[PDB]
Design an enzyme around this catalytic site. Structure first.
Site, PDB file in Angstrom:
ATOM      1  CG  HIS A  47      -1.574  -1.311   1.170  1.00  0.00           C
ATOM      2  ND1 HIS A  47      -2.540  -2.051   0.255  1.00  0.00           N
ATOM      3  CD2 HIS A  47      -1.693  -2.023   2.569  1.00  0.00           C
ATOM      4  CE1 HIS A  47      -2.961  -3.092   1.239  1.00  0.00           C
ATOM      5  NE2 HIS A  47      -2.598  -3.327   2.065  1.00  0.00           N
ATOM      6  CG  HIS A 103       2.586   5.847   4.910  1.00  0.00           C
ATOM      7  ND1 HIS A 103       2.353   5.882   6.702  1.00  0.00           N
ATOM      8  CD2 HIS A 103       1.140   6.436   4.606  1.00  0.00           C
ATOM      9  CE1 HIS A 103       0.922   6.468   7.113  1.00  0.00           C
ATOM     10  NE2 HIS A 103       0.414   6.810   6.087  1.00  0.00           N
ATOM     11  CG  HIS A 158       0.361   9.266   1.167  1.00  0.00           C
ATOM     12  ND1 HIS A 158      -0.458   7.504   1.126  1.00  0.00           N
ATOM     13  CD2 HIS A 158      -0.071   9.008   2.018  1.00  0.00           C
ATOM     14  CE1 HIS A 158      -1.157   7.487   2.104  1.00  0.00           C
ATOM     15  NE2 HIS A 158      -0.821   7.499   2.953  1.00  0.00           N
ATOM     16  CG  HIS A 172       0.388  10.586   5.739  1.00  0.00           C
ATOM     17  ND1 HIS A 172      -0.245  10.094   5.816  1.00  0.00           N
ATOM     18  CD2 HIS A 172       0.418  12.711   6.158  1.00  0.00           C
ATOM     19  CE1 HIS A 172      -1.035  10.773   4.443  1.00  0.00           C
ATOM     20  NE2 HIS A 172      -0.881  12.484   4.908  1.00  0.00           N
ATOM     21  CB  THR A 201      -6.089   8.838   4.275  1.00  0.00           C
ATOM     22  OG1 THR A 201      -4.157   7.498   4.249  1.00  0.00           O
ATOM     23  CG2 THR A 201      -5.878   9.926   5.143  1.00  0.00           C
ATOM     24  CB  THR A 202      -5.216   3.365   5.589  1.00  0.00           C
ATOM     25  OG1 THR A 202      -4.691   3.366   6.167  1.00  0.00           O
ATOM     26  CG2 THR A 202      -4.007   3.653   4.241  1.00  0.00           C
TER      27      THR A 202
HETATM   28 ZN   LIG Z   1      -1.263   8.035   5.112  1.00  0.00          ZN
END
Ligand SMILES: [Zn+2]
Ligand SMILES: [Zn+2]
Lengths: 222, 221
Positions: free
Chosen positions: A62, A88, A90, A107, A173-174
């Protein structure tokens, strides 16, 4: 359950995948958001205490995540201390400022003593290459797996000079899109070369940004 | 042993078994052709369906999606019914002002006292129904039960507006038991020719019982 950003597992369907992901579609305080209107306020200062640490890079399918097995890397805000658990990326960004999507967004996920989550967000503008991210980018697992970083990483280098931020409440957000997450989005952007963002996408397999959610009753403070 | 063709057609059901006598002597039989109605203030439906592990079955009369576990409920007037299964009919069994639809879905519920409640969804001919694709893909072509590995949320099969027609009826298949609550949704969903024909092929024939007279009943909407 398996979930993604494309196909039949896209964000629009997360809530229908499992009962535990239900908040993804029924929540009223979801993230990310498009920051347009804000209320000017006297926000408290951020105290960051990050240090070179023994971290391990991971490709979970992801995103590319940097895990901190131990504590010691903290962020203090309004008397409360939060411990950095991981950070992580995005590509492109999830949060938007006045409708503007950024090449990348980081993030930094923290947790306090009561397990209350706080996310510090850093947005990247397209530009000069980022050498501070090379140490992680050069060992980035092109497939699903974890790689132990041999040298100790100092997350401090990934943060801007001025720590002014946008403040609002939201969620992860996941999936499972858990609410009760405080969000601090830094106002000072960093940078990356279009190639760095490209290698990320190639490692992950797709763009991994969740579409912006309605602010509803929420007010963003700056 | 009954069916929709051969010597054991709907018109003969009551004659093929003493147990099926209600199919021919009942005065509150389903399905019906909804023409005249009484406008009334009906209670709002509260549907609580969620992603669940179900199994798909071809029993020779229809394609049925079974729910071995509880958790999926429908609440109307303080009463709560648990979804047991849902199946389809091609073409539709119930009609609205003489109009037969390409397909009809029946969501069968049961309360604590085993009182049956059937929620019906009618389908118009239109674009491909992608929400039915998962079930349609693993649809057993021969009599058999297959367990859909991925979770299925029946809420995706229902429209946002839950207005309905209300009347009392029976089961549309032997033994044609009465005392069945029927709630037919006013808003229609959609399917394409292929999907409808694919269903007929697996089942082996059209599985719709002809409409029955309303008699003393009134349909409220
Ligand atoms: Zn994130
Ligand atoms: Zn039926």
């Amino acid at each position: 359950t398996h979930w993604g950003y494309t196909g039949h597992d896209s964000p629009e369907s997360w809530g229908n995948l499992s009962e535990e992901f239900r908040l993804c579609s029924t929540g009223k305080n979801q993230s990310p958001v498009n920051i347009t209107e804000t209320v000017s306020g006297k926000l408290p200062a951020i105290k960051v205490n990050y240090k070179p640490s023994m971290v391990d890079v991971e490709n979970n399918g992801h995103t590319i995540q940097v895990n901190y097995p131990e504590g010691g890397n903290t962020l203090t805000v309004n008397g409360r201390t939060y411990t950095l658990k991981q950070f992580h990326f995005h590509v492109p960004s999830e949060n938007q400022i006045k409708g503007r999507t950024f090449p990348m967004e980081a993030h930094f996920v923290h947790l306090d003593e009561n397990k209350q989550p706080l996310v510090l967000a850093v947005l990247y503008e397209a530009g000069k290459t980022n050498g501070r991210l090379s140490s992680i980018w050069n060992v980035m697992p092109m497939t699903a797996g974890k790689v132990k970083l041999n040298q100790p990483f100092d997350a401090s280098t990934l943060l801007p000079k001025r720590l002014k931020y946008y403040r609002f409440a939201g969620s992860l957000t996941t999936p499972p899109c858990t609410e009760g997450v405080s969000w601090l989005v830094l106002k000072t952007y960093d940078h990356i070369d279009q190639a760095q963002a490209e290698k990320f996408t190639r490692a992950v397999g797709s763009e991994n940004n969740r579409p912006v959610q309605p602010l509803n009753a929420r007010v963003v403070i700056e």
